[PDB]
Structure 1
Amino acid sequence: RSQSEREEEWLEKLYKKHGDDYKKMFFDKKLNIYQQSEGDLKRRLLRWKKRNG
């Protein structure tokens, strides 16, 4: 189950601006427009990281 172009580019933005600070990453209004939890973010980023380097 792969990821879409827009979802991948969204996770690119989150990682490049924050890195791994999931508290700060989910309290960001600009990138995390859908007010999603920490668990959703670490799961989706690891899917992004497995498909990349």
Structure 2
Amino acid sequence: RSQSEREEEWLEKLYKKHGDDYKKMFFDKKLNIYQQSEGDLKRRLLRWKKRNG
């Protein structure tokens, strides 16, 4: 089960702006358009990192 292109770009932006700070990615109004909990962000970002490196 692989991610989509737009999701990968969104996670790209999140990682490049905040890194591993999930609390700031949770409270960001420009990148977290659909307000998503820290757990979901961490899980999706971990999948993205595992696929890329």
TM bucket, shorter chain: over 0.9
Distance 2:34 2:42 in 1: 15
Consecutive aligned runs of 4 or more in structure 1 exceeding 2 Å deviation: none
Superposition RMSD in Å: 0.5
Equivalenced residue count is: 53
The share of aligned pairs that are identical, in percent, is 100
- The TM-score, its normalising length taken from structure 2, stands at 0.96
Where does the alignment leave 5 or more consecutive residues of structure 2 unmatched? none
- The TM-score, its normalising length taken from structure 1, stands at 0.96
Where does the alignment leave 5 or more consecutive residues of structure 1 unmatched? none
